Amino acid sequence: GDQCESNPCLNGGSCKDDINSYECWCPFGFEGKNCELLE
Amino acid sequence: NEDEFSFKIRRQIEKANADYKPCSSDPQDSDCSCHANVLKRDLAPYKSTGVTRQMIESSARYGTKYKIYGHRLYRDANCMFPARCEGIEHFLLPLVATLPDMDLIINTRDYPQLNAAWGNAAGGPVFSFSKTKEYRDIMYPAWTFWAGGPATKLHPRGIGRWDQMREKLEKRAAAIPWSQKRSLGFFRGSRTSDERDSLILLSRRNPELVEAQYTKNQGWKSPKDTLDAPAADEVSFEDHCKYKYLFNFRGVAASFRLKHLFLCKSLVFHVGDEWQEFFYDQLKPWVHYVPLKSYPSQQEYEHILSFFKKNDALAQEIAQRGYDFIWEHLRMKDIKCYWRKLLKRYVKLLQYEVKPEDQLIYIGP
Ligand SMILES: O=c1ccn([C@@H]2O[C@H](COP(=O)(O)OP(=O)(O)O)[C@@H](O)[C@H]2O)c(=O)[nH]1
Ligand SMILES: *[C@@H]1O[C@H](CO)[C@@H](O)[C@H](O)[C@H]1O
């Protein structure tokens, strides 16, 4: 997978590519699939 | 050598500019016809047969299901990219009050989904932001015009708010007129396509001609992803405007970089003619920008930059037309009215009755 290339994780999050989809790791203070929500 | 190159380029400019016709008879474009050709071509393959319930159910797997039913917006619960759904919803929500029922499979992934070399029950319809002639996807203005573009240090919430970006870059383009801009090729970006490599390598070999460096993106796997150089800092959109010659490249699909370059009043060198957004069709090579074929060579770069450095008035005229086109024909109003015109024409293709689906969630308004 190459979806992380386009920087889908907001607010300082880091990204890992699966084969199907991507997943964000969100810093403390943020949540959601893209770290778009305040914690 | 230099003379044959010059003749070839000037010949192309004269021909492109003699053959050019505005995208609308009146510059204010009240009937939203500027980008109308693209929406007609995208929808054309469905004109005779139309769109059946089955086609939609079959296409559902390729994107997020949106449904307008009774002037209310519904959607699959799971959006793959929530920030991109929010950006799309910014434009749909105000149109829903005055729109007939319809089902929309909106792909929020970078890459399109309906390969026409497969076809295949890759018949669609599916909406995607970017495509080439290889794909049946219908283009729509990208989420990033409001929200959910790529996230960077300078734009941690995602590149968005095109309305604010337009004012920012207008002011900055006025602050740095042509004569004050540095006479260098500029690019700052990540290695989302290897078509970008030759310009970076040329910059390492000749930094007085080209200032091009690779940043690190969220998919970074190894130092090969910056061609073994330390990652460079991000440079703001506003600071692009201190350079005369701004390069744009495809990434995974089209890049949201491009539109920003024009508003610097800098000469935009657009590499490749395959990957599209909905407005690319009316950007005409040699009128609004300098086209380069894919996988440009270092020598091509050297020749083309040398030519324009020695034909500065010409450079500025194209730059000014580029700027004018985006200022006047990629307004927010153009984004909004394209969406509206697209959905109004699409709905006429439907050959079935839209029914509620209770698993969907209510979005608004
Ligand atoms: O220093 C930079 C690097 C990137 N970008 C923008 O950030 C987005 C992501 O750029 P990148 O080159 O990483 O990916 P692309 O979308 O071009 O494939 C684009 O809109 C760029 O214009 C920017 O403004 N400054
Ligand atoms: C990263 O994603 C954005 C759109 O998702 C696009 O501009 C690029 O093509 C891709 O690299």
Features:
heterodimer, A: mainly beta, Laminin, 4 strands, B: 365 residues, alpha/beta, 2 domains, 5-stranded parallel β-sheet, 14% strand, binds uridine-5'-diphosphate, transferase/hydrolase, glycosyltransferase, protein O-glucosyltransferase, Transferase-Hydrolase complex
Structure explained in plain terms:
- With 39 residues, chain A is mainly beta.
- Chain A is 0% helix and 31% strand.
- Chain A has no helices and four strands.
- Chain A has strands spanning 14-17, 22-25, 30-31, 37-38.
- Chain A has a two-stranded antiparallel ribbon with strand order 1-2. A two-stranded antiparallel sheet of chain A has the order 3-4.
- With 365 residues, chain B is of the alpha/beta class.
- Chain B has two domains: 1-35 and 142-330, no CATH class; 36-141 and 331-365, no CATH class.
- Helix content of chain B is 33%, strand content 14%.
- In chain B, the strands form three sheets. Chain B has a five-stranded parallel beta sheet with strand order 7-6-8-9-10.
- In chain B, strand 8 (243-248), helix 8 (257-262) and strand 9 form a beta-alpha-beta unit.
- At the A-B interface, strand 1 of A face helix 4 of B.
- Beta-D-glucopyranose (BGC) is lined by residues 110, 150, 192, 251-253, 255-256 of chain B.
- Chain B: It is found in: Endoplasmic reticulum lumen.
- Chain B: Its EC number is 2.4.1.-.
- Chain B: The record marks 81, 191, 218 as: Interaction with the consensus sequence C-X-S-X-[PA]-C in peptide substrates.
- Chain B: One of its GO terms (cellular component) is endoplasmic reticulum lumen.
Query: Which secondary-structure class do the elements of chain B indicate?
Result: alpha/beta
Name the chain pair with the biggest interface and residue counts per chain. Answer: A-B, 20 and 22 residues
How many structural units, i.e. domains of chain A?
1
Helicity of chain A, as a percent range = under 10%
Q: What is the number of beta strands of chain B? A: 11
Summarize the biggest pleated sheet of chain A.
Answer: 2 strands, antiparallel
The first-to-last residue Cα distance of chain A is: 28 Å
Strand composition percent of chain B: 5-15%
| Amino-to-carboxy terminus distance of chain B | 63 Å
Reading the helices and strands of chain B in chain order gives: HHHEEHEEEHEHEHEHEEHHHE
Shape of chain B: globular
Number of strands of chain A: 4
* Alpha-beta content class of chain A: mainly beta
Topology-level CATH name of chain A: Laminin
Taken as a percent bin, the fraction of beta residues of chain A is 25-35%
Keywords (chain B): Disulfide bond, Endoplasmic reticulum, Glycosyltransferase, Notch signaling pathway, Signal, Transferase
Pathway (chain B): Protein modification; protein glycosylation
EC number (chain B): 2.4.1.-
Disulfide bonds (chain B): 23-34, 32-337, 79-85, 241-264
